[PDB]
Amino acid sequence: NRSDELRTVYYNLPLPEDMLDEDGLPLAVYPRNKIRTTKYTPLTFFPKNILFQFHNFANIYFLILLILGAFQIFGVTNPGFASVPLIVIVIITAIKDGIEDSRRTVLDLEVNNTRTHILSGVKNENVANLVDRTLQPNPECRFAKDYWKNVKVGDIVRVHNNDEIPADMILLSTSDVDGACYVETKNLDGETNLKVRQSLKCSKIIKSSRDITRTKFWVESEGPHANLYSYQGNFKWQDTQNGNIRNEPVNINNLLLRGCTLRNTKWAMGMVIFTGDDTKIMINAGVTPTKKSRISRELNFSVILNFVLLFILCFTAGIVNGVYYKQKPRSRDSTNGFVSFWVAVILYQSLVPISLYISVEIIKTAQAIFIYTDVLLYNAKLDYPCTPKSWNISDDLGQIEYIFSDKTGTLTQNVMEFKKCTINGVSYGRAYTEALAGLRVDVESEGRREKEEIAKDRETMIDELRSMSDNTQFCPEDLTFVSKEIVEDLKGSSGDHQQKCCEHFLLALALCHSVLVEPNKDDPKKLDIKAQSPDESALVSTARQLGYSFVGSSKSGLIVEIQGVQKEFQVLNVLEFNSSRKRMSCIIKIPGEPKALLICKGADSVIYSRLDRTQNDATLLEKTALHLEEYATEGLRTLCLAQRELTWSEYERWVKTYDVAAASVTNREEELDKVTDVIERELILLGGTAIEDRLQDGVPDSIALLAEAGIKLWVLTGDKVETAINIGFSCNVLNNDMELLVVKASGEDVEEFGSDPIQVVNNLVTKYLREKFGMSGSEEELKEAKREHGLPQGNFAVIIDGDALKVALNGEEMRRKFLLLCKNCKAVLCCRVSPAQKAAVVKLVKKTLDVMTLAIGDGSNDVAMIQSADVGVGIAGEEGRQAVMCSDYAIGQFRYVTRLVLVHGKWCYKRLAEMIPQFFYKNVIFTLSLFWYGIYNNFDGSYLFEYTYLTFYNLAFTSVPVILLAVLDQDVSDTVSMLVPQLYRVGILRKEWNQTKFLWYMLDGVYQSVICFFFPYLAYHKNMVVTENGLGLDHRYFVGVFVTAIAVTSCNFYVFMEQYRWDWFCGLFICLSLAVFYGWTGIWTSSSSSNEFYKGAARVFAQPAYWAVLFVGVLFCLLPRFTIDCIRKIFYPKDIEIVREMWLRGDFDLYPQGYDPTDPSRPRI
Amino acid sequence: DEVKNRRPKEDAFTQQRLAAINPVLTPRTVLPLYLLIAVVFVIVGGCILAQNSKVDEVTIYYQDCMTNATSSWSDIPSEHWQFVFHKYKTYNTAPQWRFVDDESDDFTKQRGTCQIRFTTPSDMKNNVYLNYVLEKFAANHRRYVLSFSEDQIRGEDASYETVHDATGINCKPLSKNADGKIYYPCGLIANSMFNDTFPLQLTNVGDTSNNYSLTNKGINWESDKKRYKKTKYNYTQIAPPPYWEKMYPDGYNETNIPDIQDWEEFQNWMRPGAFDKITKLIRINKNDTLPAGEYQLDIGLHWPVLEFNGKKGIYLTHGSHLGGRNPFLGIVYLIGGCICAAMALILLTFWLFGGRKIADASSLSWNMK
Ligand SMILES: *[C@@H]1O[C@H](CO)[C@@H](O[C@@H]2O[C@H](CO)[C@@H](O[C@H]3O[C@H](CO)[C@@H](O)[C@H](O)[C@@H]3O)[C@H](O)[C@H]2NC(C)=O)[C@H](O)[C@H]1NC(C)=O
Ligand SMILES: CC(C)CCC[C@@H](C)[C@H]1CC[C@H]2[C@@H]3CC=C4C[C@@H](O)CC[C@]4(C)[C@H]3CC[C@]12C
Ligand SMILES: CC(C)CCC[C@@H](C)[C@H]1CC[C@H]2[C@@H]3CC=C4C[C@@H](O)CC[C@]4(C)[C@H]3CC[C@]12C
Ligand SMILES: CC(=O)N[C@@H]1[C@@H](O)[C@H](O)[C@@H](CO)O[C@H]1O
Ligand SMILES: *[C@@H]1O[C@H](CO)[C@@H](O)[C@H](O)[C@H]1NC(C)=O
Ligand SMILES: *[C@@H]1O[C@H](CO)[C@@H](O)[C@H](O)[C@H]1NC(C)=O
Ligand SMILES: *[C@@H]1O[C@H](CO)[C@@H](O)[C@H](O)[C@H]1NC(C)=O
Ligand code: ALF
Ligand SMILES: [Mg+2]
């Protein structure tokens, strides 16, 4: 790409009016803004599709036999028109892929047809003291209508609130002074807090909308140099007072990415720098590969095995010609050997019928349309059902063993709230969890009782608060508080010390905040609240609900209304939360006797370190500490509050030292940190607040079902490690007795393992694999770890940082050691992971220990592993519309996956596993019959069946039942499969379909064909006249039609017997297929164009010998496999029939078909 | 100033909620099926055996008549006759046979007349079939089967292009003769027509007064004649097949065109055999019951058989509702019933004597570890 040669673009330096070239620079290579998320280019689609389809081995041999079928000089008749099936199958495949790509393109177009506006009306330079107050703005300035299709480097864009970002951006002017804007990078990472972005320091003084076009400068910016958080730009401009050029550098902090969104800013104009693939999301996206199924690889292996069968058969069949051909008898009238082999191989041309891939694609399309039409996956909240985008992948779901998820929108939504707090060791607020499951089977009744109790407590809390007084903005949509004792402890019934403590706790809950209060643009009466952080917004809403409303940000103080009475405080200073400080503090002044008050909110560790442990009562602190420890070990994430009181002189010398140290210049950060440390070394804790994040509906039960079904899942996280840890503890994933094998590279451990990260992680992995459990070794260990295919053991957890995972993934020895560790473990969490890092780790886990994985996720960052997992599923909706671009499937919410992958996967994994043997049985039964017939006439190469059979049989007679068994099979009910997902173990262990199963069916088909030939032949052999009337038979075509009818009825009965769901539908098609066989034979023989037969119906269906031979063939085709299956049922009883017997006995009788996770009130007994 | 359904179909088939019946492989509902199938099909096989041993047949092999016969009645070598008669299972009764030479014909390879005198201890229930059986004569080769043209069947005046340069179904090797006269019967099927003159009557031995006559007409389907029409050629461009010259030293003149419509036997030969053993209908009787006694048949031998080590013979049968007499169907029915019953009993004894609990909710895969 482009790294050097920074692009110099002018601004407010107009070109001469007489000549224009609509640019300031000469022409250069220009990547278009259009985002191509589809598979193939519409202009160049046919060669790509054919080459992808050409990679198989059956279609190529069909093509060569059609080609070489005419190159033979007068060996076989010219085809002429006997080539259209290949044409129709390839064009129908092309049409299906073109429809898929058309859907992708229309989705891209509707994404790119959004709305954008750029100002116009005055003379622009591209497309049509410091500040003075002499020029009056022109009223001609109006916003024009613009589209994302025509945005490119050299353009300015105005963006407002509730709008996305068109491309990589540079902040020029914002709605406020100093050019500070707030952005979510949710598509890039799952951080909760807003991201601050400062604009250019040169344009921090311009205020009015026309002042942004009053200064002339130019921009020197470089192209995408393949980096993630690095950028260097130069803004140069000439002063008017003196003649000189002054420049300002721009680092990554000023750069705004593409997959972001603007919050809390009325208007901001910026400069477009990158366009098209230059965005980071396109770098991390990929190439949207072909997404080719796994089963097709071994299907091609089976096809080439059948080719080897053909070659070995004809290599010994054609050799008999020569011992009789050159010998007696004869009364008819090298190269000859080669032409005999050629005629034999063209005779046996239907060992692999063309219908293979057309049937496969038909089955896949039917499965995709059924998945789409399934109403149990419809997300009525936003009108979007489960949409399978790529229909090629509908069979891989059965082998899903590993689950990879994200935190952006997968596990949880983007909402948090307040539930509990500790005030002087007293708990306030109550929630519902599953933390009492195992401390000492009936847990549903207690859960329902607790839910009812919580609902009643919330209702009565709301009622008491609306009754005791009329709050101005009291609404129940944000009241998450439960405990009612707050009111009577505020009333004064909780003594004096506790009363003061709880009053101050409630006051501090409404003061430490970086939120700005703004009136609602819809209704001034009910003003809205827009905070810099979601937890801060939740805290402010709770403070509003509890009667300590925070309104306004005055110059000296903040408005607080207690219960209705309004008063303005006197704030003195604020120290903002820092990513390294983990504490935010406020200093205010209260007029009595005035007094300064410090209140800081921070992490538990920092709060407990910043305390006064040298004198205390040894009771309050200890009880607060024990409450903190118990919440931590239950799995709550919380903060802590510390206050202090200062006299006038104390406030004065504090502000003096602040102004002399932190208010300075030249890296004031260290001075400010020292001042904060020396002022917070002594503090008095007042209690702690607890934030709680709401997950998706039905996350814990879904995780439990996937864990117990043998699918060990992983979670890959972003923003921070403690966030992931508390999310895991909140969910039913991380247990308290579970050992946390944290893997950090640059933590506080370094003081006793200082070295390079490679050696640090090597020592860590060696001490893990030598001390607790001894399995040190690489090659033998991988050999043993190949052969488990999923087992939950170990009961430990591992936490790894981004740097640690990258340094363990760079090297192959480190990679295999990490793979061994993660296989031993069960709770692999990855944090601070880049898209490239997670793509590399998913590639490694797919390649080593070859296992078919899934990458459910949301955002523009997860595509890197989505496109790697070979199955694509993403969370769609109003929250995410960027991962669904590349994901094969797009769900409404995670709650669907836990059923979809657990039901349909298995379904299809069995359906195809049964269809393949049926398809390779139905052709063997037809071809080996001809092979056996050849032994009489000595492999001369004579048709036994009608010329139309070889083209009409596999297309009409025995095709429908196999397709219907493949598509509308129901192994078990959906409800029973969800209730007992251990059946998925069969897909986990892949024993259902394999080479041994193939060999068994191939031997069965050989036996079937042997019988199907030898029966009518031996019936004839005595007399040639077994027809009840003599009158003329013996013709080859009549014995052929007899044996073909036997074969087709045997295949239909065998399909019916193997079908697990005998309904009025599959049986109806089987009956109609047999009927159409009979009817077509009759109507073809009762016609002028029946050259040979002219009498087939009367010659076949009027003869009791024909019925007798059909019945005995039915007997000998059904009894062998039936009795083998009956014996196997007792020998090695597969779990499927046991669960089916338990289901039919009545165990799962009261359970309705419409299973609901929210109904634990089933009357078992 | 600034400013800034899709419900899926709910049907029974759309949700795959059709009326289903899951099959169950429990012994208590499948053993009765085994028993009923076994008993019903073994008894129908016994009925087939009974209806099969109710017909008699005789085969006489005379492919080597000249080299073994004399001018007088001599006994038939044992390897040339096979009898089955339900009345008498030990009815050997070796018949007699003789050969007479004809000097009027110069085809020394195959000329003369073979006379066979044989006894019959039973009667034919108003249905007699005399057939000619062949062995070691491959009549199913790929080019041999296609060696004919369907266009000539309709009687239209086909050209050399329409019979040699046609599609895969045409008479390739024998389309045209040396001079250039197009064959009306073309190909190997019509060229390999047989030259055994069978009589239209039976020469009785006991009762020479009223000795019975047969009828070879109508031995094919009546409707099938609607496809075969009379020749419509110019009686000058048609020549007999090279192996048909013995019947026409001159060819086809104005008054000798063979009407395919009434020639049932030639049409019957147009149905080439499939296996090594080939036989077609040549004599049928449904007028009167054939009585017992001695009977003599005279056969003209002009078609060569021994030159390719092949064998030919005559086959006389009453017929049956199961066609020709064959015990193979009875054997397979009996063995299928017996093996089904044995399998049912043996699975029952393993299920009872050496059988575990019918169903356990704790014997599944996860229930050991
Ligand atoms: C061609 O026309 C021929 C005259 O109608 C006839 O071919 C054969 O011609 C001879 C000549 O007389 C007929 O007579 C032969 O047979 C009788 C016994 O029926 C002998 O007494 C004669 O001496 C002589 O050998 C034949 O009868 C006659 N063939 C037939 C079948 O009638 C045919 O009409 C035409 N050719 C063919 C092949 O049919
Ligand atoms: C005189 C003997 C040696 C040959 C004549 C007997 C004939 C009828 C028998 C004897 C041996 C038989 C062969 C034995 C082996 C095979 C190979 C098998 O894959 C196809 C059938 C075939 C080809 C048989 C055809 C029929 C056969 C040739
Ligand atoms: C030439 C020899 C060595 C090839 C091997 C043949 C023998 C050992 C193999 C081939 C087919 C096999 C049989 C296939 C089917 C069954 C039915 C099952 O219920 C019992 C085992 C049994 C009976 C197998 C026994 C072993 C077997 C007979
Ligand atoms: C069905 C029928 O009547 N067939 C007769 C046949 O019996 C008779 O020998 C012949 C005499 O030329 O005339 C036919 O029409
Ligand atoms: C013909 O068969 C007779 C009867 O068995 C026999 O005696 C004679 O030798 C045979 N002729 C041969 C073999 O040439
Ligand atoms: C019956 O036998 C006599 C014997 O003289 C024979 O002439 C006659 O042709 C026979 N009957 C028939 C119909 O041939
Ligand atoms: C007797 O046989 C002749 C043979 O042509 C046939 O025409 C006639 O109908 C038969 N008679 C009866 C009563 O079947
Ligand atoms: F959301 Al991430 F690494 F950014 F899991
Ligand atoms: Mg979460």
Side-chain angles (χ1 to χ4, degrees), chain A residues 378-395:
Chain A
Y378 179 64
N379 186 16
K381 197 179 69 62
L382 59 87
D383 289 345
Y384 165 81
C386 167
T387 60
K389 300 201 166 306
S390 66
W391 314 319
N392 174 219
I393 289 321
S394 276
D395 57 358

Side-chain angles (χ1 to χ4, degrees), chain A residues 57-70:
Chain A
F57 294 153
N59 307 121
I60 62 170
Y61 293 10
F62 300 147
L63 192 44
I64 76 161
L65 62 84
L66 294 177
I67 287 296
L68 191 61

Side-chain angles (χ1 to χ4, degrees), chain A residues 616-636:
Chain A
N616 264 315
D617 290 331
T619 54
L620 311 183
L621 282 72
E622 282 72 358
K623 66 183 182 180
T624 51
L626 72 86
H627 275 276
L628 272 295
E629 65 219 60
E630 66 183 1
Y631 296 138
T633 186
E634 190 277 331
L636 304 169

Side-chain angles (χ1 to χ4, degrees), chain B residues 64 67-69 74-80 97:
Chain B
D64 49 330
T67 65
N68 299 104
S74 179
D75 291 327
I76 315 177
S78 61
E79 67 274 11
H80 291 344
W97 68 281

Side-chain angles (χ1 to χ4, degrees), chain A residues 15 70 87 266 270 314 524 580 621 762 823 838 897 932 940 980 1112 1120:
Chain A
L15 291 201
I87 317 304
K266 254 292 191 173
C314 291
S580 45
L621 282 72
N762 189 359
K823 189 54 183 302
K838 47 184 172 272
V897 172
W932 289 129
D940 193 27
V980 296
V1112 65

Side-chain angles (χ1 to χ4, degrees), chain A residues 45 187 545 945:
Chain A
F45 165 74
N187 309 353
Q545 286 311 304
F945 309 154

Side-chain angles (χ1 to χ4, degrees), chain A residues 601-663:
Chain A
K601 55 94 171 183
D604 54 330
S605 57
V606 59
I607 282 298
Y608 279 60
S609 52
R610 283 171 153 86
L611 269 179
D612 289 324
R613 294 183 183 175
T614 181
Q615 72 274 16
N616 264 315
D617 290 331
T619 54
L620 311 183
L621 282 72
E622 282 72 358
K623 66 183 182 180
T624 51
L626 72 86
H627 275 276
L628 272 295
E629 65 219 60
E630 66 183 1
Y631 296 138
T633 186
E634 190 277 331
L636 304 169
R637 47 174 310 180
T638 179
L639 301 172
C640 312
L641 295 174
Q643 63 159 345
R644 203 176 71 171
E645 313 281 350
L646 304 173
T647 186
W648 264 117
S649 71
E650 272 178 333
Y651 155 64
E652 284 295 332
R653 93 286 184 276
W654 157 82
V655 71
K656 173 178 295 301
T657 189
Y658 187 82
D659 300 327
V660 71

Side-chain angles (χ1 to χ4, degrees), chain B residues 240 244 247-257:
Chain B
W244 275 31
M247 283 73 74
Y248 309 99
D250 49 344
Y252 308 101
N253 53 45
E254 75 283 349
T255 177
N256 64 359
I257 301 299

